[PDB]
Amino acid sequence: SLVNSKLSNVKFKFINSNIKVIKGEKFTMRLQIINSSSSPLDLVVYYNNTINPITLENQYQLHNKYRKIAEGIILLSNDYKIPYFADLRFIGIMSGYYGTLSGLKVLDLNTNELIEVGNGASVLI
Amino acid sequence: KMTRNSWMMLDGTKTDFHITVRNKSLSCAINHIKIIPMNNIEQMLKPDYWKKMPPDDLYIMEKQLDWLSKSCVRIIKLITFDLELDNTAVPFNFTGFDLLIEYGMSATDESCIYLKKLSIPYEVTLRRTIEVPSMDIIPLNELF
Structure with missing residues (x-):
C-alpha cells in the first residue's frame, strides 16, 4: 500500500484497491500524495517505456521480465504536473499479472532523485 | 503594419497605397491578385533541414539572416495603387520568424530594364x- 520517501515527508498510496480486474480496455487509477507543505509541489511522473538493456536462461529471463514491464501498459498522461489528488491515466496492451508494476517514476524537480512507486497490481483477465 | 496570425492560411488586403510614380493616375495594366507570400519559405526551409541532416558547414549555413524576413517581391508592368490580396498561407514557419517585407518592382519600358524599388x-x-x-513507439502482441 504505502512506501515512504527518501528526501521529503511524501508518502504514496493508491486509493483504488491494489488488486483489480480489467480487460484490455481503459481503466481509472488514483494515487495519494501526502507530504509536508514546505514545498508541497513540483513532482513529475513518467512511465519510461524502454527496455532495461541487461547464466543463459537467466539472461533470457531478465529480458523477458523487462520486455513485459516496458510493453504491457502505457500511461496516457505522462509528464503529469501534480498541483493533492491526481487520477493517473493508463491503458494496458497485453495481459498477465503486473504485480509491482514498476515502470512509473515520480521525481522531485529540485535535487533529482529517481523516486519509484513499486506498488499495486493489475490482472488483465 | 499589420498584426498577428495563428497557423491558418489567412489573407491580407492592406489599406494604404504606396507612391508608385508614373505619368499619372492611369491604369497600371497588370495588377497582381494572388500575391502568395510564404511560398518561398517551403523551398527555403526544407533545403535548410535536409542539409542539416549532415553536420552544418555549408554555404546555406554561412552567416545567413534572410530567414528573419523571407522577404518576397512583387513584379509588375507599366500612379498609386491600393494593396492586393495576399493569401499569406502560414503553415510551415520557424519560431524565429518575426517580420516580412515587400520590395515591389514598379516597371515601365519601351525596350529597357527601367524599374525602381518600393x-x-x-x-x-x-x-x-x-x-x-x-x-x-510501442509495438503490440495481443489479439483483441
Whole structure:
C-alpha cells in the first residue's frame, strides 16, 4: 500500500484497491500524495517505456521480465504536473499479472532523485 | 503594419497605397491578385533541414539572416495603387520568424530594364497554438 520517501515527508498510496480486474480496455487509477507543505509541489511522473538493456536462461529471463514491464501498459498522461489528488491515466496492451508494476517514476524537480512507486497490481483477465 | 496570425492560411488586403510614380493616375495594366507570400519559405526551409541532416558547414549555413524576413517581391508592368490580396498561407514557419517585407518592382519600358524599388515594413507575431514536444513507439502482441 504505502512506501515512504527518501528526501521529503511524501508518502504514496493508491486509493483504488491494489488488486483489480480489467480487460484490455481503459481503466481509472488514483494515487495519494501526502507530504509536508514546505514545498508541497513540483513532482513529475513518467512511465519510461524502454527496455532495461541487461547464466543463459537467466539472461533470457531478465529480458523477458523487462520486455513485459516496458510493453504491457502505457500511461496516457505522462509528464503529469501534480498541483493533492491526481487520477493517473493508463491503458494496458497485453495481459498477465503486473504485480509491482514498476515502470512509473515520480521525481522531485529540485535535487533529482529517481523516486519509484513499486506498488499495486493489475490482472488483465 | 499589420498584426498577428495563428497557423491558418489567412489573407491580407492592406489599406494604404504606396507612391508608385508614373505619368499619372492611369491604369497600371497588370495588377497582381494572388500575391502568395510564404511560398518561398517551403523551398527555403526544407533545403535548410535536409542539409542539416549532415553536420552544418555549408554555404546555406554561412552567416545567413534572410530567414528573419523571407522577404518576397512583387513584379509588375507599366500612379498609386491600393494593396492586393495576399493569401499569406502560414503553415510551415520557424519560431524565429518575426517580420516580412515587400520590395515591389514598379516597371515601365519601351525596350529597357527601367524599374525602381518600393519597400514596405511588416511586423507580425505568432500564435503558438499546439505543439507535439515528444513521441515514442510501442509495438503490440495481443489479439483483441
